[PDB]
Write an enzyme that holds these catalytic residues in place. Structure first.
Site, PDB file in Angstrom:
ATOM      1  N   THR A  57      -5.114 -20.536 -11.859  1.00  0.00           N
ATOM      2  CA  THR A  57      -5.936 -21.345 -10.970  1.00  0.00           C
ATOM      3  C   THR A  57      -7.421 -21.122 -11.207  1.00  0.00           C
ATOM      4  O   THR A  57      -8.203 -22.076 -11.195  1.00  0.00           O
ATOM      5  CB  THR A  57      -5.584 -21.043  -9.523  1.00  0.00           C
ATOM      6  OG1 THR A  57      -5.921 -19.684  -9.233  1.00  0.00           O
ATOM      7  CG2 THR A  57      -4.106 -21.237  -9.304  1.00  0.00           C
ATOM      8  N   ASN A  58      -7.835 -19.880 -11.432  1.00  0.00           N
ATOM      9  CA  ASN A  58      -9.227 -19.563 -11.733  1.00  0.00           C
ATOM     10  C   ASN A  58      -9.283 -18.892 -13.093  1.00  0.00           C
ATOM     11  O   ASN A  58      -9.544 -17.687 -13.189  1.00  0.00           O
ATOM     12  CB  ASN A  58      -9.823 -18.657 -10.663  1.00  0.00           C
ATOM     13  CG  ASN A  58      -9.920 -19.339  -9.338  1.00  0.00           C
ATOM     14  OD1 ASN A  58     -10.269 -20.510  -9.263  1.00  0.00           O
ATOM     15  ND2 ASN A  58      -9.606 -18.617  -8.277  1.00  0.00           N
ATOM     16  N   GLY A  95      -0.780 -14.864  -7.248  1.00  0.00           N
ATOM     17  CA  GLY A  95       0.170 -15.075  -6.186  1.00  0.00           C
ATOM     18  C   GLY A  95       1.033 -13.862  -5.925  1.00  0.00           C
ATOM     19  O   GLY A  95       0.948 -12.848  -6.621  1.00  0.00           O
ATOM     20  N   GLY A 111      -5.452 -10.435  -4.059  1.00  0.00           N
ATOM     21  CA  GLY A 111      -4.602 -11.501  -3.579  1.00  0.00           C
ATOM     22  C   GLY A 111      -5.280 -12.365  -2.547  1.00  0.00           C
ATOM     23  O   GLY A 111      -6.501 -12.322  -2.402  1.00  0.00           O
ATOM     24  N   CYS A 146      -9.759 -18.781  -3.913  1.00  0.00           N
ATOM     25  CA  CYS A 146      -9.034 -17.701  -3.257  1.00  0.00           C
ATOM     26  C   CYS A 146      -9.335 -17.696  -1.766  1.00  0.00           C
ATOM     27  O   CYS A 146     -10.500 -17.642  -1.366  1.00  0.00           O
ATOM     28  CB  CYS A 146      -9.409 -16.359  -3.872  1.00  0.00           C
ATOM     29  SG  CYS A 146      -8.893 -16.134  -5.577  1.00  0.00           S
ATOM     30  N   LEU A 173     -12.360  -8.925  -3.923  1.00  0.00           N
ATOM     31  CA  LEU A 173     -11.812  -8.182  -2.799  1.00  0.00           C
ATOM     32  C   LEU A 173     -10.341  -7.926  -3.076  1.00  0.00           C
ATOM     33  O   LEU A 173      -9.550  -8.865  -3.157  1.00  0.00           O
ATOM     34  CB  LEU A 173     -11.995  -8.941  -1.489  1.00  0.00           C
ATOM     35  CG  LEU A 173     -13.292  -8.757  -0.711  1.00  0.00           C
ATOM     36  CD1 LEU A 173     -14.443  -9.461  -1.362  1.00  0.00           C
ATOM     37  CD2 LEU A 173     -13.110  -9.238   0.704  1.00  0.00           C
TER      38      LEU A 173
END
EC number: 1.2.1.10
Lengths: 445, 474, 50, 50
Positions: free
Chosen positions: A114-115, A195, A213, A246, A419
């Site tokens: 996704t990133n 994920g 996450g 995120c 994070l």
């Protein structure tokens, strides 16, 4: 030199081991030149990496990738410019004690779909700041972009005084080479993100591991709030890069007495409600094996609308469903990674707080939570909401995203990544990752 | 070192700055794992809250601005009376070949101060001229830097003044820390210690002697770098009008249309406060009378020229606090790539941008639509009926149409071509480089205060419809 | 001879303004670099909490 | 009120005079007119309620 089998895997692991042992003897004033050159040359190539990522992965929007790539480079550079990470840190000269610092070793890095291109710069920069080495394990869908990003950073660093390599990456990944590299003997720390599938695999391997996450982030709207600005903020933050950032918004809990008006405020704008048969036609598509159908990620609203099996206006933005049950068996309670949303109804304020706690207890990692209310008349509700919720960030009248007007929204915030936590189970708050997580300090006497 | 690994000797303690042998724990088993001491910070999770805070606005300028016809030698008398002894002049070599830089040196050598000229500035700053200039500066050690010219010598002087004050700070962190204003994080090194800067303008139509902007081009990669914060504004600006009496047409027309666009944009941007609307309207008022009279004759009419000069620096006051828009960025790139002079680039572009921003309410990429901005329609109407171009009973769209019908008649008698093709741009290399310029003019600070948030497919529409000589319409 | 005159436009160096901007304005005097201060006011403003 | 009315009329006279004086340049006509513009709407509304 390509990498496909276990033998050349062991070859390049030995190469980067020799190179990391070569590199961990430099001084402080010659690590910083490498860091500036790497950060500048990573920030120059904003546009081509975004073009490559959209061309290869097949989803996403180009402009949002440009701006988040720029922000993720400049924040990491400006935050850690002049920090003692090499040599003597502190001393007590009239009593003999000196504290020195020493690195860890070789880090494994796992990159999601996704990133794909922003995390590589982050992990590469904080690795070679603190005299370490890094091996990337990309995903089979988008893999050429990540290797291109790591390659740009690498040959930027080479022509400044670095050894012959420090960064490695895998061509043609599979399900066995990742497990081969996670259980290799002489690596020391793994950095996994994405994920819930592979962070549990990273946890149960008997090695030091932190996981980046995201949880399902709820938004509480009470009766004494402005209504237009809240809906504007949610619709602005959710459609950013089709909601693959995120820990974006995932659920909206609305108190009853101002409920229905908010409904038409989503109806007279980009949102589209759905209250009939079509819910089943969208509840059968997001969750096919109990494990998050990978055909609706990063896609626009109308494409998943027609893949669900019906028609919709073209200029619509968000699909709004409304459910009453809160459990694991309900399909909308999961994180979705798509421009969709689910909303709930509550009786009063404490019921909404209780239901939001029940929502955030399902993700496993507390990241953010949002409240929309008047802040100049009800400080007691603010203190109560800050008391009861258990996440890292608690946002009052603020979207959980980036890019508005003025300085930044908000300007004293890190990116949504960086994070990470160290567990999965329960009541585990995340915390931001920096160079102090990659350095072991020693003392003499 | 020379110490037992236990407790209890004589004296204070062996050793006294040590914890017990326990309290030190690790978190792994495997390899090269150092332990660390356990305390209360391993048993506490900390949380943070964040409220929505409001912002503040400002109004910043140079400390003193001297202006009118024949005021150059009486302005720089006060630098003689207090108290400076060494000087440095930065200019272009065309101004040095003619008799212009001698008007400063002849006055300064009458009282006696060490002067020298750096006449090596190209049409664009090239990041290596400024290093030779900074080498000359800290070899000479002046304490007054006087910039003369317009455009390139001024921001060349700003950049070579910022590294004379701090010779250790390297250029890359200046390019990374300081790229936009609206961001007060964190701070700039303190300047003005051992020099100060004077700005003298020559051409009528740029306002760069009151603005904190600089753009530096790199030689090797051809990469642009903006620099922008309010510690680069000069300490004194001199606006004289005897320096501009002999420039030919149509060098005056380019500066006039440049100031037109700078005042037209900075009234409708989303950072427009109430301290800077009035001077934007005053700049727009002073041009529509005195610009064609200064274009047709001159210097046979030595009144309109000085008023156009003064109104150009008024619009320079205006846009330094509420920033620019999209046609500025597109004009910079279209001018830098095809070697068009800057100034007629945005003369060709402004009508399509006015048709772009004046859309009723497509809520597709809007932001805080009910918060501060009224509309971009209404402020164009306010410009139109302030400027005196309306029947007493009208509606909005008629006022907008009467507005943009006007400046096309203005562009008629100022004598500029009708599309980019008549300026001498071939179709081949333009269709080759349209997608280069299309997204490259997206990231280049627009962001920006455009009222409508753009996207890349809508900018190449404008870049095509301006080349063929059409109008943007849906 | 008869000499002509010149005009000017002079202001303070920086003006900060709007609703709720007092404590964020005087933060930059904390960050650079002052250590001693003096306040001049009227006694009515001192009797109230200003 | 009427401490606000005194300051309002004070600013009215300060803007009314400084536009017609014989030292009025063109840098300071625009802000005199802007000050005169901003009072005739917002002064009675601030006088009656507030």
């Amino acid at each position: 030199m390509a990498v496909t089998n276990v033998a050349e895997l062991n070859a390049l692991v030995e190469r980067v081991k020799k190179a990391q042992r070569e590199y961990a003897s430099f001084t402080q004033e010659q690590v910083d030149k490498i860091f500036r050159a790497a950060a500048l040359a990573a920030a120059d190539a904003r546009i081509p990496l975004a073009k490559m990522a959209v061309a290869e992965s097949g989803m996403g929007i180009v402009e949002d990738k440009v701006i988040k790539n720029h922000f993720a480079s400049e924040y990491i550079y400006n935050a850690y410019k002049d920090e003692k990470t090499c040599g003597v840190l502190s001393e007590d000269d009239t009593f003999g004690t000196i504290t020195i610092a020493e690195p860890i070793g070789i880090i494994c890095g796992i990159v999601p779909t996704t990133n794909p291109t922003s995390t590589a710069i982050f992990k590469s920069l904080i690795s070679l700041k603190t005299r370490n080495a890094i091996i990337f394990s990309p995903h089979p869908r988008a893999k050429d972009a990540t290797n291109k990003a790591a390659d740009i950073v690498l040959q930027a660093a080479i022509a400044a005084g670095a050894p012959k390599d420090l960064i490695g990456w895998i061509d043609q990944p599979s399900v066995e080479l990742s497990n081969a590299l996670m259980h290799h003997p002489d690596i020391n720390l793994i950095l996994a993100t994405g994920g819930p599938g592979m962070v549990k695999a990273a946890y149960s391997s008997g090695k030091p591991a932190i996981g980046v996450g995201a949880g399902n982030t709820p938004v509480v709207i009470d009766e004494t709030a402005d209504i237009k600005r809240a809906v504007a903020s949610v619709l602005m933050s959710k459609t950013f890069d089709n909601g693959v950032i995120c820990a974006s918004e995932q659920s909206v809990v609305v108190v009853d007495s101002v409920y229905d008006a908010v409904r038409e405020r989503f109806a007279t704008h980009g949102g589209y409600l759905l209250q009939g048969k079509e819910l089943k036609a969208v509840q059968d598509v997001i969750l096919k094996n109990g494990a998050l159908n990978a055909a609706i990620v990063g896609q626009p609203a109308y494409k998943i609308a027609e893949l669900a099996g019906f028609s919709v206006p073209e200029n619509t933005k968000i699909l709004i469903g409304e459910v009453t049950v809160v459990d694991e068996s309900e399909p909308f309670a999961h994180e979705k990674l798509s421009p969709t949303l689910a909303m709930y109804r509550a009786k009063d304020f404490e019921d909404a707080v209780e239901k939001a706690e029940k929502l955030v207890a399902m993700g496993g990692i507390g990241h953010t939570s949002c409240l929309y209310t008047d802040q100049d008349n009800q400080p007691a509700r603010v203190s109560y909401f800050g008391q009861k919720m258990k996440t890292a960030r608690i946002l009052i009248n603020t979207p959980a995203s980036q890019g508005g007007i003025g300085d930044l929204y908000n300007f004293k915030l890190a990116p949504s990544l960086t994070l990470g936590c160290g567990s999965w189970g329960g009541n585990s708050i995340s915390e931001n990752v920096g160079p102090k997580h990659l350095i072991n300090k020693k003392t003499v006497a | 070192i020379n110490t037992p690994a236990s407790q209890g000797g004589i004296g204070d303690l062996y050793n006294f700055k040590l914890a017990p042998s326990l309290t030190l724990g690790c978190g792994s088993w495997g390899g090269n794992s150092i332990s660390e001491n356990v305390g209360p910070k391993h048993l506490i999770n900390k949380k943070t809250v964040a409220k929505r805070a409001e912002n503040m606005l400002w109004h910043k300028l140079p400390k003193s601005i001297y202006f009118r016809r024949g005021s150059l030698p009486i302005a720089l008398d006060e630098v003689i009376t207090d108290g400076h002894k060494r000087a440095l002049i930065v200019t272009d070599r065309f101004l040095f070949n003619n008799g212009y830089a001698d008007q400063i040196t002849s006055v300064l050598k009458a009282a006696g101060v060490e002067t020298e000229v750096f006449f090596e500035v190209e049409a664009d700053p090239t990041l290596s001229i400024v290093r030779k200039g900074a080498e000359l500066a800290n070899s000479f050690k002046p304490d007054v830097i006087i910039a003369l010219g317009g455009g390139s010598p001024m921001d060349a002087a700003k950049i070579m003044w910022v590294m004379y004050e701090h010779p250790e700070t390297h250029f890359e962190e200046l390019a990374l820390r300081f790229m936009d204003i609206r961001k007060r994080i964190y701070k700039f090194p303190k300047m003005g210690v051992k020099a100060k800067m004077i700005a003298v303008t020559t051409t009528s139509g740029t306002g760069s002697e009151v603005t904190p902007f600089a753009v530096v081009t790199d030689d090797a990669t051809g990469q642009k770098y903006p620099l922008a914060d309010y510690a680069l504004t000069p300490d004194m600006a001199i606006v004289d009008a005897n320096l501009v009496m002999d420039m030919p047409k149509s060098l005056c027309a380019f500066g006039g249309l440049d100031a037109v666009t700078h005042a037209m944009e900075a009234y409708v941007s989303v950072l427009a406060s109430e301290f800077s609307d009035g001077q934007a309207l005053q700049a727009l008022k002073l041009l529509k009378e005195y610009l064609p009279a200064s274009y047709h004759e001159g210097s046979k009419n030595p009144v309109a020229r000085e008023r156009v000069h003064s109104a150009a620096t008024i619009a320079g006051i205006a846009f330094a606090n509420a920033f620019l828009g999209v046609c500025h960025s597109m004009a910079h790139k279209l001018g830098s790539q095809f070697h068009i002079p800057h100034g007629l680039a945005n003369a060709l572009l402004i009508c399509n941008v006015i048709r772009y921003n004046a859309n009723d309410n497509p809520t597709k990429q809007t932001a805080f639509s009910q918060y501060d901005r009224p509309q971009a329609r209404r402020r164009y109407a306010e410009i139109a009926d302030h400027l005196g171009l309306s029947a007493p009973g009208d509606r909005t769209a008629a006022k907008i149409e009467k507005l943009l019908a006007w400046l096309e008649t203005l562009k008629a008698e100022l004598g500029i071509p009708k599309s980019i093709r008549e300026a001498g741009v071939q179709e081949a290399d333009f269709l080759a480089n349209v997608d280069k310029l299309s997204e490259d003019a997206f990231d280049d600070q627009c962001t920006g205060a455009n009222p409508r948030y753009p996207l890349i497919s809508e900018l190449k529409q404008i870049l095509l419809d301006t080349y063929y000589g059409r109008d943007y319409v849906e």
